[PDB]
Design a protein around this ligand. Structure first.
Ligand code: CA
Ligand code: CA
Length: 289
DNA sequence: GGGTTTCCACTTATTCACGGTTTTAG
DNA sequence: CCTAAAACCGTGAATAAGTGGAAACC
């Protein structure tokens, strides 16, 4: 094992995909103020893509990888001084989804802990206000212990895709390359490239159609950006990710996706031998892989 | 060393990735 | 008539986040 460096925009794009921040406020009787804290950033992936965590850790030289279950692997960046490396990276390469607001409050808690103010109750009360507008909110225990209020209202992030490398990192995490075999008589193979995201990023999802110049948005939360015209796929969708290399097992799925795209380009998908060969490539990829 | 950090094990709520069909476009 | 691109489904699980516990640090 040697690991490889990852494009920082592909990394920042992947952080927008599967990344997550954490801010812990735990009841600690041994603590002086009665509550200890832990701040950092984490990513949880499947064991099949554990190489990404090693390559992400090799690029930053921070964080630790530990098994997050029988079928999961996680990377946690909890060291305080090491968080400065993750912070300085995101300042130069900012987030574009609804996670940028979480990083803004991630810095707002690092600064409280930077001045060592997280040991006094007056400073701890500030950390309780930060946790409200971030994350999933405070638990019932933390809400009962602190009746004080916080006012900020996390505003919806309005940003645009900076470059293709961000899209490559985001699509590597939240993108799906599917080969659709529609059933019909006589003797249909369809290629679709869907991307699922929450309704909170509908501003980004709507801009994704104009950014690539194609696609339609389907419609509970949820959302979906789908492209089906083979002219757009073979000319605007497939060559974009070929220039900006992907990361993870989805690259091998993309590699097997281009093979079926070349057959449709040669129009050999109508042949029985071509359709049979597509079934072999389709079954040995995506969920079957 | 006495609070304080940082690390490992392990869990939980839901947005995912992903599949398959029925129906319209042209 | 024909193959294409669009529209509708539907769910399991890999996620996005979370806690308990104790070691390790200074
Ligand atoms: Ca996400
Ligand atoms: Ca994924």
């Amino acid at each position: 094992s040697r690991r490889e460096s990852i494009n920082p925009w592909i990394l920042t794009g992947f952080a927008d995909a599967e990344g997550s921040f954490l801010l812990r406020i735990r009841n600690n009787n041994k603590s002086s103020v009665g509550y200890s804290t832990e701040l950092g950033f984490q990513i949880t992936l499947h064991n099949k893509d554990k190489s990404i965590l090693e390559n992400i850790q090799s690029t930053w030289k921070v964080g630790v990888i530990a098994n997050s279950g029988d079928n999961a692997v996680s990377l946690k960046v909890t060291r305080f001084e090491d968080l400065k490396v993750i912070i300085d990276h995101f300042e130069k390469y900012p987030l574009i989804t609804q996670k940028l607001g979480d990083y803004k409050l991630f810095k707002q808690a690092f600064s409280v802990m930077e001045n060592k103010e997280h040991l006094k109750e007056n400073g701890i009360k500030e950390l309780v206000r930060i946790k409200a507008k971030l994350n999933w909110g405070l638990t019932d225990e933390l809400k009962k212990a602190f009746p004080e209020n916080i006012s900020k209202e996390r505003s919806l992030i309005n940003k645009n895709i900076p470059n293709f490398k961000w899209l490559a990192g985001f699509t590597s995490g939240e993108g799906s390359f599917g080969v659709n075999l529609i059933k019909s008589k006589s003797k249909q193979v369809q290629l679709r490239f869907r991307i699922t995201q929450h309704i909170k990023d509908k501003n980004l999802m709507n801009s994704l159609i104009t950014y690539l110049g194609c696609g339609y948005i389907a419609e509970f939360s949820w959302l979906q950006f789908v492209v089906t015209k083979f002219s757009d796929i073979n000319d605007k969708i497939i060559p974009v990710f070929q220039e900006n290399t992907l990361i993870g097992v989805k690259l091998e799925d993309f590699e097997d996706w281009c093979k079926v795209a070349k057959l449709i380009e040669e129009k050999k998908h109508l042949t029985e031998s071509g359709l049979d060969e597509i079934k072999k490539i389709k079954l040995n990829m995506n969920k079957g892989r």
